[PDB]
Symmetry: C5
Subunit: 307 residues, 5 copies
């Protein structure tokens, strides 16, 4: 049972695809195991870069293929290097850029909690053939969060585990318990942009929306809210074109709903005010004074959504 | 006639291309057939990964090309593996990411249901040389629908059949009946985003549009309905930028049409109400307040359109 | 002069790029010719896959390169195979996905019909070395046009002809007439989306535009028409965001022009009615009632554009 | 010093990227030079296609690398051909599609003149090793200009030159004078589309914007110009989402500015009319009659624009 | 410790990706070191391009892989060339196009200043085996600045250093010491475009916003500011679709925020102005004549947050 030691160097996590539940990771893979000792030129380890590795493999170098389980497509492989030691041990080193998949919940956008994950697993060798001895992951992390879209939180979770496959080939004495490396890197979304350029102005609109009740005439009151209705639509599109595409509503998506909700409510109140009547235009001088009702009523219903 | 057992593992279905009628599937293919016995090191099964597989083929190993019939372009191939047994049998294993083709009807968007299909067929060996003995497809699925764009519902449909080609080649008899595997996976669109962020608000717009008839003046009535016209267009663009490109109208596209009409309907009546006359101000002293007619009249036309 | 019979299978025609004048074609190529008789295993036809094809050619198998003349870039090739029969016979079969170019006039959008074209020609061998004996094209077409973007019409036109090149080496008897296969497939665009979601609402905009003359006050007359101007613009953008970009105007583009045209013309009259005068206030109360006058003048100008 | 005769065949120039200052060129390369005599089968020229070309090179055949100096990335190479003649001649022929880079000034869009340029230079061999004897360029196109976005006007510019590099590796006497082929093709943008669908309605926007002065009341003056401001804003995106991205302003970009200026200018004129007074109400009937001033006052600032 | 001299030729720096913090670099790498002398044909240096380089490496030529440390993914390499001199020295020459990574702060866009960085480091050999003697960088450009997006300042700053990794594998003495070349090019964004076409009109918008106070009735004042709110919103989408996507606000974003604030501020004043009381509505004589207070008050806060 070959003991293989692994090291992950995380260079960059970027390009989250919200609809695909996808992100990109640039970094290096380092794999190490000990084979039977051999002749090295001089006596210091021999280095084999890129092209020449396939010719070592053709003549019988055992370089087990380690597959990135949750990678979408096949990773862009940078330089590869084999360092063969005289005492026997062999180290595989290669840089990669890959597209990885993991469950990504984006509902409380833009205040996301996600975790970028790497899962590594031997393509052909089970726990009886190849096992992962240990793994440290290096997030060459620090500084400049305010410049970056994502703020990394942990220093990285690691687990070596055994995954068993029930539905196989026509093999089964115990050949079904492959050993797996799992890397987890926690992150929080940078909410500042969506706050000031989306949350705040949207807020001013909805608030300013309510000032429609400070109009004197019923006529002014009613046709005016049609322009404000027209405003939320323009705002929605502005948001729409910019926000990440998702199959569900975000918090922002919801503020927009409420905004529409504000105005349709206002239309009804304005109308109700007018034609509930004792003459012709007895605008009930109590509901003309839904001036403070609806604005503070919007705060209460806004606060029911928290639990 | 070589019997081949096939197994597809579906890892990810994503990337719907609404216009090209295409979807991308990440997964593994496993194909098994029995060849001539020959003797592997020790006598335990011996593994041939990626690069070395082709080197076996040069020395004459029969590794048949099984083509993805409905794949668009040629798929991203991950690691390949041959597991060669001494008793003869050979197992082909490979990971793929492929863009697949299938007829896709999007008229009832965002309530379309689709089925993602794989078609596999040996490229060159007909049913009398190579035939598909069986195929199982395992969709590693569960839970999290509320998070995903698509909801897979069946656990997968299977079809092994014979495809007959009437013309080619200059072979006569029946080297024309290649054996084909067809995998089918049903899905429903998560309509939640489009419900709350498109259906509901458009509904409120059309609804508040009807609020034009509570206006007292004719000028108010007529001018305000222009704002209503401008709003549906603004919403129309808002919609367009997000909705998928199609060559036919969707349900949402139709609500848009409904909106334009309602307002255009109102314009005509408001004009009609005020201008055929004995008067100047000839508001038929009670179409005035077709306040419940037309709103109710629009809903009736709505339930006929569901026919 | 080697006689080569070719057969094309068209699987999918899609992804027209309007600016580039290009479209994508997925299908299979088949080429057959007779060489010198050879010895196949047994006496059965020998089949050769992908990789192994070149190794046949490295020791001298003649496989002439047939170039897709009007292809943009070089095609994505799927599985390839050589079928070698003992009597001399050779069949080349390969799947391809290619981006092809042809002159595409898009002025009468969305009522354009285009023709998808394939041109195939030997890369190195002229009239006298390689000859196209014949070619059939199988358009595996049928049904459901209502779902697809393009409506394939013919059963595809075919023409084998001789193309002469004037600029050679200065080689002397008739070294210059490569033989060319030309496949033509006619198509018409599905206008259904654009009719109901673009033309129709645009018409309603233009129509409701004319209702400005049913306003009684001049302020309303002039002020309102600015709101209608704004509407045509909002409609223009919505349209632009969706429509294919071209270097010329489409029918829809022209309709947008008319909308701008309709309103600016109205503006002048509304002003003209008011201020060309015999007092200050005699609105020509008939040019006011140009109410249905240039609506049919607009219909006349629309119907004159066909001759 | 080897004489190399070159021929460029331009098939297609398309896909200009305004931001990268990039354009795509499809065509064939033809290179011919005289080597030491060879003895070919029979003795009429021997043809070597694609893959087998590398096998001749391994075998000591001199096929010099000619680099496309100004290509961005490395070209999609189609089929390659070696024609080896018995008298010594060697002709290299290949199809290519590449994105090329060149300086492109886009300030006066859409009335741009651009020139699509090709530069070819041997990658490794200087003028004293490899020299360009002559050069022909063949542009496979004519007619149908009003269908294409760029109108090729000239034929093809050509110049063989010697480029000297002062900063090399440090090789001393004269190994720094590589010979360079420069192909230039002049073209005009098809401005028709932008004239009819952008410039023209923009004019109608601006002109009708000025009609705000034929309004009677002061409130009418001011309020409407806000609708007019909103309209021009409205025009900008409609414009923005469609026009190519640049880092500097175009003709059109300025036209928009002018519209903004015009409206802002109007507001001021309009407020001023009302409030500089001999009473309060003295609308100076020359500044309210800037009905013709301000319109032709823009045309003056307008034709000084052109000079 | 082999001393290697490097030369970077920058041809073009383009296509910055703001979200990815990425830029594209087209150019050449030249690496030279001195080997043990050889025997070349005749005695003049022998040239080995592209394909035949791997065949020289197979026979034992030491061509060390120098990795672009901060390259995202793996670069498009053009032609490769080995120049082998008889005195021993070996020159690696090859063209590249790559996407590179570096921290890019875009907060003061469009007045950001950035710095393009290249990092090179041998992939397998530490300072004691391969050492960087020097590096020359050729920035082949100057002038033509108002047309270019970025204004280059330096002619490239460079610094060669020794990087040691704390977390290695099996090495004990001090062999953890790879030598790194760091290339820096300082740059300016040309802000003129965003000045005239985004800053200016946004400014005219905010300015005319203040003209709301030159309205006479309260209904016009309050009702008009609703249209102006809509204008800024309309401006926002305009802007955002065009401005580069970032995870933070730019200056321009903040100008937008200010517009909303200005208008929302105007709303409160106009209403506050109105229910002000000693009666029902006594218009406070000068607080509505903050017609010029608020604008220069906006100019004052405009100048304070700059500090």
């Amino acid at each position: 049972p070959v003991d293989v030691s692994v090291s992950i160097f995380i260079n960059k996590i970027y390009g989250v695809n919200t609809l695909e539940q996808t992100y990109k990771v640039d970094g290096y893979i380092v794999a190490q195991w000990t084979g039977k000792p051999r002749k090295t030129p001089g006596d210091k380890p021999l280095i084999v870069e890129n092209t020449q590795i396939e010719r070592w493999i053709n003549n019988g170098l055992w370089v087990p293929a380690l597959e990135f389980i949750n990678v979408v497509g096949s990773p862009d492989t940078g330089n590869k290097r084999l360092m063969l030691f005289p005492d026997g041990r062999v180290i595989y080193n290669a840089r990669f850029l890959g597209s990885f998949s993991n469950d990504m919940d984006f509902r409380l956008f833009p205040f996301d909690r996600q975790q970028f994950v790497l899962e590594l697993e031997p393509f052909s060798y089970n726990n009886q053939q190849l096992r992962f001895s240990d793994i440290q992951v290096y997030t060459e992390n620090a500084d400049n969060e305010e410049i970056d879209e994502w703020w990394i939180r942990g220093k990285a979770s690691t687990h070596i585990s055994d995954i068993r496959y029930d539905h196989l080939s026509s093999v089964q004495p115990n050949q079904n318990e492959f050993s797996r490396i799992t890397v987890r890197i926690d992150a929080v979304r940078n909410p500042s942009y969506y706050l000031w350029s989306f949350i705040l102005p949207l807020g001013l609109i909805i608030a300013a929306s309510w000032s429609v009740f400070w109009l004197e005439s019923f006529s002014e009151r009613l046709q005016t809210s049609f322009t404000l209705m027209l405003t939320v639509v323009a705002y929605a599109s502005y948001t729409s074109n910019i926000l990440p595409r998702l199959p569900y509503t975000t918090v922002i998506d919801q503020m927009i709903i409420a905004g529409y909700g504000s105005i349709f409510a206002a239309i009804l109140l304005i109308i109700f005010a007018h034609h509930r009547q004792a003459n012709g235009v007895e605008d009930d001088l109590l509901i003309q004074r839904c001036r403070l009702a609806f604005p503070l009523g919007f705060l209460a219903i806004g606060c029911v959504l928290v639990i």
